[model samples]
Target: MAVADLALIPDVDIDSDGVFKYVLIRVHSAPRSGAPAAESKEIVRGYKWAEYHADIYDKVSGDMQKQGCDCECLGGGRISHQSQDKKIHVYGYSMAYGPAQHAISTEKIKAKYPDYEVTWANDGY
Candidate 1:
């Protein structure tokens, strides 16, 4: 069975605000003027993620998988941030190994990926 992995953004609820969306980016530490490099400390920025959805990822792609009437249930939060920079790391993830949930709908998933600006689909595009 293909185990669906739901990535739980551990950085959620970071900013001093209420429950919302935010992007956790790691900024390099640099020494100020006469200061030594040892005086610098790692900085993490939790800026609000995008809030609107456009035509960015509206459509689906890839060759169709010839699987007949597979249980099409799905749900939960996910992340698709891609970057070559090694500094970009996932804070953490919550996993459940089993069939997809029939109760999970796009509406419910909204609470999952609060940072997502587009509609969430079971078949990842």
Candidate 2:
């Protein structure tokens, strides 16, 4: 599975259709800047992750993989920002129940470059 999906988004509270969503926040620390370096303390901007009709991943993607229907069940999705050195990051995600839910959609993003860091999640977006 790809590391950072730029299509699959997560939500916080449940929606009218009961297809609530959420964001998977993670932090990472990498090497420091060098003489030839241009920037320092970078941040990973938030990007959308593909949603899907994940029977195994009912909501978000994780180590737990059961059984998926092998379909793309797209849903409301967005991101707070890309990589950042800040404290709080926010994202928006939603969907309709029954036919839709926060799942891994067929769409995917190239895995994040191995050099950014995750600071904190504020549950806002």
Candidate 3:
């Protein structure tokens, strides 16, 4: 499958102590158009406080591509860390796309990497 011409923005928020609060990964379609909001949707995932270590955007983006769901990262911060078990937990929403592509993509990541844990929620848009 061809890569979707969508904008994958990972907005990372941190606390005063520079600890990662959470990273909201947003995927926007028709980003360059006059009104991109009409075709865009937000995918949010919560996480426990952790120091910034790996790049979730890059990692997820690659995973998406591996599953044939390509996307472009227009802008955002890269902040995420692995757990004590040295495993990264990936979170996604079921409404990211039709037929739960986002969730499936996340599951693919878990399948690809035995050290990774994938979680998804039915965040109705």
Highest lDDT: give the candidate number.
3
lDDT of 3 by residue, 1-125 (tens): 23344344432222222124233444545333332343544433233332222244455555544534435432222223345544443332212222233453345445545334545444322
Mark the regions of model 2 whose C-alpha exceeds 4 Å error after superposition.
Answer: 1-69, 74-76, 82-90, 95-111, 119-122
Off by over 4 Å in 3: 1-19, 28-40, 46-50, 72-125
**Which model is ahead, 1 or 2, in terms of lDDT?**
2
Question: Which candidate would rank higher by TM-score, 2 or 3?
Answer: 3
RMSD list, candidates in order: 19.8, 15.7, 11.6
lDDT of 2 by residue, 1-125 (tens): 32322222222212121122333222122112112222212112122233322322343333211211112223333333343342222234433323222122211111242222222232332
User: Which residue ranges in model 1 land beyond 4 Å of their true spot?
Assistant: 1-16, 38-41, 47-125
Candidate 3: worst-modelled 10 consecutive residues by lDDT: 10-19
Candidate 2 residue-wise lDDT at 51: 38
Q: What tens digits encode model 1's per-residue C-alpha lDDT throughout 7-60?
A: 211213222222222221211122121222322111112222422111111110
